[PDB]
């Protein structure tokens, strides 16, 4: 229902306001330094979580803190075959969360993938290029899904001829 | 660890310099006297050579090791030349031509182990170093000529030439350059 260009622009601006991190040594352990969004041990360091949504299926949650922000996405599963392709796409990507440095090794329940951005990343990597990555991820993922669907048809169509032809 | 360290450092032996001055058995001339027993520091470096070059680490256990590591490097330099020799007779004279070359003395720059050898402080050590280190080389060459050239054809023997590529802890007596 909602078109792509207005929806993406809204997510960009919100995420630009949330990416305002600073370093913060924790209050509740002697000198540990940890992302407040994950440990949630303090509860005045947390920002109000906000959702942007294109329709009832596609939405983004932006959830910030003085030193960290978490972004979690859900994508339109347009048919049964696409659920399986999508889930496995995430797993093989998420399996390299040590190279996608902003990526959590697990999604949030009810979300398909989720990024944890700490102050160290926004100090060590160009902020506007991380946001461009998150936007680019949404610009492509349903093209990248559909391309596998076209190829999975082709594989089966070859396998059928390879069996039937030898009769 | 268990590399072959120098055996001969009996404390009754004189110990001139930063290295064991030792009684090099030769008909050449120098500051060191003549050993009479059948075993000697040049024979020791020759004997242990094929083993020593594989050990990638080597301590200085005593002063005689700072001799032995230098004899080993010169032995390698012998092979770097004898391998080219067309016959044993050339392998002798073209070895003497190497012995009387101006090798960097350990305190001189361009020697590879300047961290490990102290400077010779005065002429009566420095000139002793010139007259000792040549007496090492002059003898060391004449001993390899007899046993690198296997007697059937004065080929430089293959087994020895294998070691031409291998250098004792990858240090070279060519220094930073010849």
């Amino acid at each position: 229902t909602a078109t792509l260009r207005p929806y993406l622009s809204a997510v960009r601006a919100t995420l630009q306001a949330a990416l305002c991190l600073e370093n913060f040594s924790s209050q509740v352990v002697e000198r540990h330094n940890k992302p407040e969004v994950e440990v949630r041990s303090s509860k005045e360091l947390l920002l109000q979580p906000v959702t942007i949504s294109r329709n009832e299926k596609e939405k983004v949650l932006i959830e910030g803190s003085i030193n960290s922000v978490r972004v979690s996405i859900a994508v339109k599963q347009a048919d049964e075959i696409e659920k399986i392709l999508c889930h496995k796409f995430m797993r093989f990507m998420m399996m390299r969360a040590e190279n996608f440095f902003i990526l959590r090794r697990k999604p949030v329940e009810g979300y398909d993938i989720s990024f944890l951005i700490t102050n160290f990343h926004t100090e060590q990597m160009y902020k506007h290029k991380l946001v461009d990555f998150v936007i680019h991820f949404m610009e492509e993922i349903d093209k990248e899904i559909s391309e596998m669907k076209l190829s999975v048809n082709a594989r089966a169509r070859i396998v059928a001829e390879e069996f039937l032809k030898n009769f | 660890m268990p590399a072959y360290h120098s055996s001969l450092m009996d404390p009754d032996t004189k110990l001139i310099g930063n290295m064991a001055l030792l009684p090099i058995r030769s008909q050449f001339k120098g500051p060191a006297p003549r050993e009479t027993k059948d075993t000697d520091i040049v024979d020791e470096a020759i004997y242990y050579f094929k083993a020593n070059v594989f050990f990638k680490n080597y301590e200085i256990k005593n002063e005689a090791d700072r001799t032995l590591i230098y004899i080993t490097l010169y032995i390698s330099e012998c092979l770097k030349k004898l391998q080219k020799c067309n016959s044993k007779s050339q392998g002798e004279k073209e070895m003497y031509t190497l012995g009387i070359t101006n090798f960097p003395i350990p305190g001189e720059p361009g020697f590879p182990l300047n961290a490990i050898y102290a400077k010779p402080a005065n002429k009566q050590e420095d000139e002793v170093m010139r007259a000792y280190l040549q007496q090492l080389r002059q003898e060391t060459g004449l001993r390899l000529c007899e046993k690198v050239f296997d007697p059937q054809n004065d080929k430089p023997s293959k087994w020895w030439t294998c070691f031409v590529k291998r250098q004792f802890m990858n240090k070279s007596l060519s220094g930073p350059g010849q």
Partner: protein, 373 residues
């Protein structure tokens, strides 16, 4: 200082670090590792122009370790190479570093408790048979903490490089039978960290490498506050992964090993040692004490020694004691625990063998120092 103008020095003789200063100084002047070593040729290294002595010692032997086969003369508090031990002191008092260079000035020694008696006595020999010192004393390593902290009652937890000790002191009385040792100290945590990085495919094996994983340990490691929370944050998210640069410039990466290694202090069974973790060995010590003294030990836990520096260790330690007291004293009467006043002295200054109380408050001039006899 002395009315004779003599100076007085403290040596911690530490199993890993010798630590030296003059009496009354709030700081040591020199901290340096106890390494002693000989030059060794190595294929993997270019031999420099830097001169290597036939025996490097101390700080120099640490920076030039890449050329050196290095020993520790001290192991687990017992001298195991007495010749390198002499050479380490001969370096300490020589022209280099703490240049007293003399017999006339006094030295304090610190010995661990429950120390094999011959170890103590050989030190007292060489101090008078070799340096011919004018004044020497051997102090109970545990009491020096409370002198520096300015206390008289409390239980001293003293995790050095070699061995961990717990020693109660009550209003200045030594209670010896409540001494305990735990054989987990900074050295074992280092070797255990080597093994943890070996699983991640980094090989460290030279003696020169041991100092490198120590420098890793000191900068990246920490003790988990709620070990379940650390494990979930490792499993769920990447933030624990952090880089380090080895001497050759390999940009190695280390992860949950940052907390899995220090945890061995609370779980000796992760290493081969069978026993109880520091918190529970501390709790059993207090519980063995005579019943009225326990009320004060809970309020005056005192921390000493570099292996207590790990981020969060005071917080982790306090949690295990509160939970132990809930489980075994209040018998799960949870809400009562608001009454359990417990406090840990964890002052950020914690090379806690400073000398002020032990020297100047003990003698400006006195018959206490042992003397040539």
């Amino acid at each position: 200082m002395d009315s004779q103008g003599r100076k007085v020095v403290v040596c911690d003789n530490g199993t890993g670090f010798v630590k030296c200063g003059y009496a009354g100084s709030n700081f040591p002047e020199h901290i340096f590792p106890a390494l002693v070593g000989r030059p060794i040729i190595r294929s993997t290294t270019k031999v420099g122009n830097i001169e290597i002595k036939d025996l490097m010692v101390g700080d120099e032997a640490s920076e030039l370790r890449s050329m050196l086969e290095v020993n520790y003369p001290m192991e687990n508090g017992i001298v195991r190479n007495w010749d390198d031990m002499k050479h380490l002191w001969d370096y300490t008092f020589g022209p280099e570093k703490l240049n007293i260079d003399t017999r006339n000035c006094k030295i304090l020694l610190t010995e661990p408790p429950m120390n094999p008696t011959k170890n103590r006595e050989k030190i007292v020999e060489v101090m008078f048979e070799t340096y011919q010192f004018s004044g020497v004393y051997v102090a109970i390593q545990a009491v020096l903490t409370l002198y520096a902290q300015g206390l008289l009652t409390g239980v001293v937890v003293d995790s050095g490089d070699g061995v961990t000790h717990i020693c109660p002191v009550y209003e200045g009385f030594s209670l010896p039978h409540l001494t305990r040792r735990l054989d987990i100290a900074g050295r074992d945590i280092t070797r255990y960290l080597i093994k943890l990085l070996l699983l991640r495919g980094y090989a460290f094996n030279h003696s020169a490498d041991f100092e490198t994983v120590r420098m890793i340990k000191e900068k990246l490691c920490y003790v988990g506050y709620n070990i379940e929370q650390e494990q979930k944050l490792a499993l769920e998210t990447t933030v624990l992964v952090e880089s380090y640069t080895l001497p050759d410039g390999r940009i190695i990466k280390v992860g949950g090993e940052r907390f899995e290694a220090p945890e061995a202090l609370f779980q000796p069974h992760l290493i081969n040692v069978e026993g109880v973790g520091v918190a529970e060995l501390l709790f059993n010590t207090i519980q063995a004490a005579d019943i009225d003294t326990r009320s004060e030990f809970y309020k005056h836990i005192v921390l000493s020694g570099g292996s207590t520096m790990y981020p969060g260790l005071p917080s982790r330690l306090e949690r295990e004691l509160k939970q132990l007291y809930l489980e075994r004293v209040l018998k799960g009467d949870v809400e009562k625990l608001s009454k359990f006043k417990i406090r840990i002295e964890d002052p950020p200054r914690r090379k806690h063998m400073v000398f002020l109380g032990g020297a100047v408050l003990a003698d400006i001039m006195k018959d206490k120092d042992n003397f040539w006899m």
